[PDB]
């Protein structure tokens with residue numbers, strides 16, 4: 164038995180498992196299946212620990228997973244989950260500037276608004292100081308959570324834009340090896 | 354998109370991942386690759402959480418994984434890792450009685466001897482009381498760790514017998530879907 168070629172086969176399978184778990188994480192996020200999202204995140208994170216070298220495509224995959232994990236934890240490092248999602252975003256999917264900026268600005272506004280929604284206005288100002296203007300600071304100071312600014316840059320709008328991005332990732336990975344072979348087995352029966 | 358057939362494909366892939374991770378756990382245990390064992394155990398345990406219904410073959414697979422996990426933690430529920438491995442053993446691989454009894458008796462003796470080796474003789478007597486005789490209790494009372502009884506029923510002998518069993522599991526699963534497809538990709542290049 165060759166311990167080098169056996170290790171190589173394990174790295175190939177890990178790559179296959181990573182793409183399959185990214186696809187599964189994307190559907191759970193799209194469908195709002197929270198428990199399924201948490202279980203798939205736990206499996207992807209464990210599989211990622213078995214990888215020590217990643218290709219450019221594999222790095223994009225894990226960073227999309229990390230991004231969706233922080234977005235899902237948004238209303239729950241020393242910064243908040245949405246501020247952390249903001250850092251991952253920017254280093255990923257920058258090539259499509261128009262849709263990238265929309266999601267970026269929606270996350271920026273919502274990282275403050277979720278703190279206001281939770282009644283933690285001191286944290287809302289701390290997030291504002293770290294991200295960033297005089298009118299947004301007035302809104303926070305006045306606890307004006309339902310200001311028309313927050314209704315255009317809303318949570319639902321942030322989720323809709325992110326969900327449309329997840330649909331592009333979902334279509335790009337729908338034909339990866341592990342999911343394609345699995346779907347074939349299901350359709351063969353049936 | 355059919356959410357029922359998509360879920361079915363995820364269950365097929367999970368089954369494939371489970372067998373692949375069992376095979377990988379068996380090789381790491383055989384080779385003594387501790388860190389690789391810990392990482393594969395973490396991945397298998399996470400994958401198993403994504404399964405809610407298991408076939409008879411899948412139950413045997415997870416129980417072999419649980420058994421090797423306790424055996425690997427042997428020198429580290431309210432009972433010790435080896436007493437816990439003893440409980441998993443018995444409910445699995447009972448059909449081959451001769452080799453089954455050898456491993457069972459070696460684990461029984463070693464669950465006491467590892468406590469003596471660690472200097473915890475009060476625990477060695479507590480393990481003895483839970484598992485089970487007058488001569489074995491004399492050995493523990495006298496802190497006779499290197500008695501000729503413990504040299505026939507040794508740790509190395511327990512590991513050798515368990516490793517020979519892991520080699521049978523390893524040969525039975527060497528041709529599972531995920532590892533076979535992965536090895537083929539490696540040999541195609543080379």
Ligand SMILES: COc1cc(Br)ccc1CO
Nearest residue numbers: 191192195196197200235
């Ligand atoms: C609908 O958006 C999601 C999806 C999951 Br899964 C978990 C949380 C959220 C947002 O609170």
Ligand SMILES: COc1cc(Br)ccc1CO
Nearest residue numbers: 204207208211228229232
């Ligand atoms: C690779 O690291 C991951 C992967 C997932 Br999925 C979720 C979170 C992290 C890091 O906190």
Ligand SMILES: COc1cc(Br)ccc1CO
Nearest residue numbers: 381382385386387390425
């Ligand atoms: C050689 O037997 C093993 C294998 C692994 Br991995 C971890 C622990 C042990 C026994 O202390």
Ligand SMILES: COc1cc(Br)ccc1CO
Nearest residue numbers: 394397398401418419422
């Ligand atoms: C399915 O449950 C597992 C699986 C593995 Br691998 C290791 C430990 C456990 C339970 O403590």
